[PDB]
Amino acid sequence: ILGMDELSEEDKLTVARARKIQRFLSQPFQVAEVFTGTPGKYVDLADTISGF
Amino acid sequence: ILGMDELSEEDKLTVARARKIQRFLSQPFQVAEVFTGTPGKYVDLADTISGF
Amino acid sequence: ILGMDELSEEDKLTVARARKIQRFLSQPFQVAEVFTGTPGKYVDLADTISGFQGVLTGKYDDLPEMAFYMVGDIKEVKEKADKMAKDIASRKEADNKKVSEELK
Amino acid sequence: VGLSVSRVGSAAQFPGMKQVAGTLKLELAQYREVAAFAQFGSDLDAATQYVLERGARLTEMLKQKQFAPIPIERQTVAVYAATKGFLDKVRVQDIVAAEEAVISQVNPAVFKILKANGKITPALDAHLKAELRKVKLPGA
Amino acid sequence: VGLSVSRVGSAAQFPGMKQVAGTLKLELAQYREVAAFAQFGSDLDAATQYVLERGARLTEMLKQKQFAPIPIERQTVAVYAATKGFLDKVRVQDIVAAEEAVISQVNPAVFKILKANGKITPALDAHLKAELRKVKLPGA
Amino acid sequence: ALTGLTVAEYFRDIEGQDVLLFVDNIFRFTQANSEVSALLGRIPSAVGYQPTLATDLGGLQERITTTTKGSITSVQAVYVPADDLTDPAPATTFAHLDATTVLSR
Amino acid sequence: SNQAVKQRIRAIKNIGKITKAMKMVAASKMKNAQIAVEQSRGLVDPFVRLFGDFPAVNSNKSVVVAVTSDKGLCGGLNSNITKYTRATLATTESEGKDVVVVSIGDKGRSQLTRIESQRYQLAIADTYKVRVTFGQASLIVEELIKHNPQSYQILFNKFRSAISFKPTVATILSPDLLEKQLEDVTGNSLDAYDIEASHERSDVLRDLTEFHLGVTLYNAMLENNCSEHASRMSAMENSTKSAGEMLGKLTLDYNRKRQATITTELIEIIAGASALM
Amino acid sequence: EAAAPAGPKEFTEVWNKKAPSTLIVPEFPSNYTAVKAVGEGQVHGDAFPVNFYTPHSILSQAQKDTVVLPGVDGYFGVKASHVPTIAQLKPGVVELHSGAESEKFFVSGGFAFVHPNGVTDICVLEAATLDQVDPAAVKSALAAASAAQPTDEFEQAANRAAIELYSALESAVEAKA
């Protein structure tokens, strides 16, 4: 409605971190390599926990 | 949003009249005196119209 | 919700032209003249094509909204603005020299 | 007033009332649209304020109380006294009392002329403009 | 909290929990009325900010940790700590770690007299009030 | 509710008094007659109710009147189902109510 | 078809809560701005009693400033003073005067470009972002004195009460270019004053009109900021009204659809069971 | 000599013919002031109206019996029916006297108009009173401000303003009671 200008920068921090988390959940698939463009990744559990 | 003393001199008269009207709508009940202590007051119709 | 004050200016142009053509699709009927009083207008195809083309290009942005309401052509919105405008002053000064006398 | 319709009863009504009710209908249409124009009290126009007070005059004129229906000539004379002048001095409040004073203080022969002639003749609205100026309206 | 109800209500509550829940539910009700307005933080209001911060103090108190049920005297002590104002020292992001810094640090005698008495006594709300200041609350 | 109305109707007819009736939750009267009509195999009307909703309500509510002997007055608790005053059970109930007393928190 | 109406009810309900929050925060910011506005109104009075008030001067160059807002939920404030800006540019112009059009606020360059695209020359914005100070108004006045006009016009909304904002034109004349010429009436009205400066009276008037422009500008964009807050307070109150109207109509519509859903889903069950029984 | 007969009552009569008739006339800053300059009266005796202003404050708008102003030629005192004056003020102390008590307002420069009707309008930017001044930063401020003089003329002006302001401030903070 407004446009992310009236949020006191503790809400803008979690908006930016949540957008980073929203993108970082997406992962290419080795069965969707023929769909879009990308060789698929297999993330380990330790790498997942450390990255998030 | 403005303050209780922001009002006009006539609207404060209506506030002071309605606040004592809505007090006067309350009434002690005859059946409630076994647990409230104050005795109950039956009010007749002419008394209600005249007082209000 | 927000009113028209929050629009862009091309959006206010869109709203003004759309209210104009909304009123301009309205038309009096020759079978509704018995219960409305307004006589009904047959509008030829070339006339309505040219009128709506003119409102779309912008040639009638000066005219108000209610001059388009219940008129036949694009001439009659101009004559209804002429009729509406002239009155905009004519409101009173009908005091006496009446037909409402007591002997004549 | 905007949604209610009777077109079959139109051109089948009282001619004296059909004279006055046309400008009544147009003034109420203008009143509804200048009330829809004002969703807010912040900007006054003083040209729409005239029809915004004439419309609140006519709305107060139109409302009547229960179980007392009014004959058609006393409706015609009251709406004649409302859509014309003769009522601009009462604000919005005393227009019921003003309409009752119009009905009671106007000479009751003019109701008989309006009933038997059916319409308002020139010799009749002459005495309408005459008899309406000599009534005393309670909002002054 | 707004939609949950109990039609027995206050007749079947722990006395002493009854003494703090009456203002806890009122304060949470006011916080729910000013809820979703704490997205304007620099756009302060200075009177709704107190009830917004206290409502955030109280909703982070009521959270629990999954097959760790709490005895009623310890819950009563936690609500008495948070609704009297001892926890405005505390950062709101670690109130859930501040109540192990109330329950484990208050000596286990307040709990025994609150359980056996079954209500808050003037002696106890002097004593544990004095005990609620020698606690090492995680503030910054 | 018919049993309570009979107990009030004796005081109205035979004793000649001004009786009060308290049909607590008239909506539950409607609900129970809806369930009775459903168990008897009847096709339900609008939203889910008995086809006889207005008639099963008017059979109750028309015996609560003033006679030349005395009167029965009803203070019936009303429930509004989906906070919807146009639901057929409160819409049919409000056609009989001569007064509403709203108690609020 | 009954989850679109439910999510529209959710949309209009959160819009109404957003708008009531905006209304209460504008009502709070109007009160904290009224502290600063009524104090700054004092310094305007000595210059308007010393130099008078001369709006229709025959200047051959003017710099017009329309003091607009940054945020746009004001409800017809910036449009009202854009109308007033062109209705003073069509009034004070007399002979072919060069008019420099300036805007203070982002909502001025959006509309003064739409009116006066060629005479628009400067755009001050972001001024109410932290607060308005006199050094800020002084720097803006310095940038207006980079041009050398014979007059200044400041178009702002005078915050009178919480509902009344009147647009105001405040005129500052250049010191001996036009101001001393407008003060002499067969002699002067300024020669009553014993000048107690170091250098000449032209220099003390050159300092005094820069100070008058800075004071007028500071007060102008305090008054306009207070009217901005008190006009957002009424725009976000009518928008909660209309978002309550839309929500009530949507709830009536949703209950009609809920009843119709239960009826048709029950009629399907009866029609399927009557084909088997 | 007055070839443009300007003014608000002329703008409101010329503005009706060049503007749309829907817009009411704009207000002017003369309509929001009350005390004028040329108008009669407004002194009545030994007191006289002193409007001590600031952009962010109104320090006094009462009546005083004498006003000491720190003019650029030197400190002068305004009594009741003073000569009309447009005095540019040096950094110094205004004292508003109202009997035995004296509020010592150190201003940082500005102006001070004594009008024909006896109204004093002191118009300064910053006016600190003398108790909220520290005497510690002014001495290293004068020592440092008497040191850095490059070939810039702008910093010569700013440094001269610095040394005259801090020197007047030490003169008015070491000579108090």
DSSP secondary structure string for all residues of G148-197:
--SEEEEEEEEE-SSS-EEEEEEEEE-IIIIIHHHH-SSS-SSTTSEE-S
Helix H or strand E encompassing F24: none
CA distance C45 to C63: 22
**Cβ-proximal residues to C52 (8 Å cutoff; 6+ apart), any chain:** C21, C24
C2 contact residues in G (CB cutoff 8 A): 73, 235, 239
Contact status, residue G49 vs residue H115, Cβ threshold 8 Å: yes
Tokens standing for residue G152 = 């200044």
Nearest CA in chain D to C32: D7
Tokens of G147: 């041009």
Distances (CA, A) of E119 to E89, F77, G220: 26, 37, 62
Which candidate, E62, E65, E75, E56, places its Cα nearest to that of E16? E75
* Chains in touch with D (≥3 Cβ pairs < 8 A): C, G
For C89, phi then psi, to 5°, come to -110, -35
Q: Tell me the two tokens of residue E19.
A: 């003494």
DSSP H66: E
Across the interface, whether the CB atoms of G163 and D40 are under 8 A apart is answered no
Instruction: Give the three-class secondary structure for H113.
Output: strand
What is the C-alpha separation between B21 and B28, in angstroms, rounded?
16
- At residue G102, the 3 state secondary structure works out as strand
**Tokens at F65, concatenated:** 């009147």
Q: Look at strands G61-67 and G98-104 and give their pairing.
A: parallel
Location of structure tokens 């090492």:
E136
CB contact at 8 A, E64 and E70: yes
Query: What's the length of chain C?
Result: 104
Which residues does chain D break after (C to N > 2.5 Å)? Answer: none
CA distance linking residue F75 with residue E68, whole number of Å = 48
D41 touches chain G (CB under 8 A): no
Closest among E132, E13, E123 to E81, alpha carbons compared: E132
Q: Are strands H120-124 and H110-114 parallel, antiparallel or unpaired?
A: antiparallel
First-to-final CA distance of chain C = 60
Burial of G82 (C-beta count, 10 Å sphere; 0-12/13-18/19+): buried
What would the two tokens of residue G175 be?
A: 């010191």
CA-based nearest residue to D17, from D122, D101, D120, D95: D120
Q: Return the CATH number at C48.
A: 1.10.1140.10
Compute and round to an integer the Cα radius of gyration of chain G.
Answer: 28
d(CA E20, CA E4): 18
Structural domain boundaries enclosing E68: 14-140
| Domain membership flag for residue C23 | yes
Nearest CA-CA distance, residue F35 and chain G, Å: 15
Phi-psi region at A42: left, alpha or beta (left = phi > 0; alpha = psi -120 to 50): beta
Pick the closest to residue H146 from H132, H156, H135 (CA basis): H156
- The closest alpha carbon to H36, from G193, G48, G216, belongs to G48
Chain D residues with CB within 8 Å of chain C CB = 7, 10-11, 22, 47, 50, 122, 125-130
Best residue of G15, G19, G24 to probe chain E, by most E CBs closer than 10 Å: G24
Contact, F54 vs F92, CB < 8 A?
A: yes
G43 near A CB under 8 A: no
In 3-state terms, what secondary structure has residue C38?
Answer: coil
The answer to whether residues E84 and E61 touch, using CB atoms and an 8 Å cutoff, is: no
Cα–Cα distance between D80 and D119 in angstroms, integer?
A: 12
CATH number of the CATH domain containing D119? 1.20.150.20
- Length of chain H counted residue by residue: 177
Resolution (A): 2.9
Question: Can you tell me the distance from the alpha carbon of D59 to that of D54, in angstroms, rounded to the nearest whole number?
Answer: 9
Distance of CA D118 to the CA centre of its chain: 18
Match 């649209």 to its residue by tokens.
D33
Please give the radius of gyration of chain C, using alpha carbons only, rounded to the nearest integer: 19
Phi-psi region of C37 (alpha: psi -120 to 50; beta: other; left: phi over 0): left
Angle between helices D122-133 and D72-83 (to 10 degrees): 70
Identified catalytic residue from D7, D57, D74, D91: D7
CA distance G108 to G70: 9
The Cα G206–Cα H35 span in angstroms is 25
| CA–CA distances in Å: residue D83 to residues D62, E27, H15, H126 | 11, 58, 37, 66
CB-CB contact of H91 with H109 (8 Å):
yes
- Give the residue from E22, E81, E27 showing the smallest Cα distance to E54: E27
Chains near B with 3+ CB pairs less than 8 A apart are G
Q: What residue type is assigned to position G129 of the chain?
A: K
Distance of alpha carbon F96 from its chain centroid, rounded? Answer: 8
- What is the distance between the alpha carbons of residues G114 and G109, in angstroms, rounded to a whole number? 8
Taking the C-alpha atoms of residue F30 and residue F40, their distance in angstroms, rounded to an integer, is 15
Nearest one of D98, D105, D22, D95 to D58, comparing CA atoms:
D95
- The answer for G157, left when phi > 0, alpha when psi is -120 to 50, beta otherwise, is beta
- Residue closest to G170 by CA, chosen among G251, G90, G63: G63
Please report where in the chains the tokens 């703008």 appear, as a residue: H11
| Run of H or E residues at G271 | helix G201-274
Question: What whole-number distance in Å separates Cα of residue G221 and Cα of residue G157?
Answer: 9
CA distance G253 to G99: 56
CB G232 within 8 A of CB G69: no
* Domain-located, residue C99: no
Distance (Å, whole) CA E92 – CA C54: 64
| Burial of B21: CB neighbours in 10 Å, binned 0-12, 13-18, 19+ | exposed
> Contact, D54 vs D31, CB < 8 A?
yes
Residue F31 in 3-state DSSP?
Answer: helix
Find where tokens 């001495």 sit: H139
Confirm if D129 and C98 have CB atoms less than 8 A apart: yes
Q: Is G104:G66 a contact under the CB 8 Å cutoff?
A: yes
DSSP-based helix, strand, coil % in chain G, nearest 5: 60, 15, 30
Q: Which of H71, H32, H33, H67 is nearest to H48 (CA)?
A: H67
Write b or e for each residue in G43-66: b if 16 or more Cβ atoms lie within 10 A of its Cβ, otherwise e: bbbbbbbbbbbbbbbbbebbbbbb
Produce one character per residue of E101-125: b if its CB has 16 or more CB atoms within 10 Å, e if not: bbbeebeeebbeebeeeeebeeebb
> CA angle, D97 as apex, D94 and D102 as ends, to 5°?
120
DSSP type of residue F15: I
Task: Count other Cβ atoms within 10 Å, centred on residue G191.
Answer: 13
| Amino acid identity at F57 | L
Q: Which long-range contacts (CB under 8 A, 24 or more apart) does E18-26 make?
A: E18/E119, E19/E80, E19/E119, E19/E120, E20/E76, E20/E79, E20/E80, E20/E83, E20/E84, E20/E120, E21/E79, E23/E83, E24/E58, E24/E79, E24/E83, E25/E1
Q: H67 forms bridges with which residues in the sheet?
A: H78, H96
Q: Which residues pair with F71 in a beta bridge?
A: F18, F66
Our measurement of the distance from residue C68's CA atom to the centroid of its chain's CA atoms, rounded to an integer in Å, reads 3
- C41 burial type by CB count under 10 A (0-12 exposed, 13-18 middle, 19+ buried): middle
Contact G133, G96 (CB under 8 A): no
Question: Any binding-site annotation on D7?
Answer: yes
Query: Is G198:G192 a contact under the CB 8 Å cutoff?
Result: no
- Facing residues of G63 across strands? G100, G152
> Is H70 strand, coil or helix?
strand
Q: Which residue has the tokens 């628009």?
A: G120
The three-point CA angle H44-H48-H51 to 5° equals 145
Structure tokens at F18: 């001004």
- The C-alpha atoms of residue G189 and residue G51 are separated, in whole angstroms, by 9
Cross-chain residue pair C100–D11, CB shorter than 8 Å:
no
H or E segment and range at residue H112: strand H110-114
Rounded to an integer, what distance in angstroms lies between the CA atom of residue D83 and that of residue D16?
A: 14
Cα angle G231-G233-G238, degrees, rounded to a multiple of 5:
95
Q: How far is CA C74 from CA C46, C57, C59, in A?
A: 11, 13, 11
d(CA G153, CA G137) in angstroms, rounded, equals 15
CA H98 to chain centre: 19
Whose tokens are 């001024």? That residue is: G127
Sort out which chain G residues have CB atoms less than 8 A from F44's CB and list them. 266, 270
C-alpha pair distances (Å), D122 with each of D37, D111, G31: 38, 15, 64
DSSP-based three-state secondary structure for G66: strand
Say if residues D116 and D68 touch (Cβ distance below 8 Å): no
Angstrom distance (rounded) from CA H58 to CA G225: 20
User: What residues make up the domain containing C14?
Assistant: 1-93
Q: What's the rounded Cα separation, in Å, for the pair G16 and G241?
A: 8
What's the CA gap between H122 and H89, in Å, rounded? 9
* D36 vs G: CB within 8 A: no
Instruction: Give the span between the Cα atoms of G87 and G82, in whole angstroms.
Output: 8
Q: Which residue is listed with tokens 């949470």?
A: E28
Burial of A45 (0-12, 13-18, 19+ CB in 10 A): exposed
Handedness of CA C3, C5, C11, C12 (dihedral sign): positive
Across the interface, which of G111, G114, G242 has its CB nearest the CB of C1?
A: G242
Q: F60 near F1, Cβ under 8 Å?
A: yes
SS3 E27: helix
Helix (H) or strand (E) holding G56: none
C4 contact D CB<8A: no
List of domains in chain G: 1-24+236-277 (1.10.287.80), 25-235 (no CATH)
Give the Cα-Cα-Cα angle G111, G112, G116 (nearest 5 degrees).
130
When scoring E45, E49, E51 by the number of chain G Cβ atoms within 10 A, the one with the most, hence best to mutate, is E45
- Beta-carbon contacts of residue D62 (< 8 Å; ≥ 6 apart): none
Which residues contact residue E11 at a Cβ distance below 8 angstroms, ignoring those fewer than 6 apart? none
Q: Strand pairing partners for F19?
A: F72
Residues H162-165: contacts with CB under 8 Å, at least 24 apart: H164/H90, H164/H91, H165/H91, H165/H108, H165/H109
**Looking at chain F, which subunits does it touch, using at least 3 CB pairs closer than 8 Å as the criterion?**
G
Residue A37 exposed, middle or buried by CB count within 10 Å (0-12, 13-18, 19+):
exposed
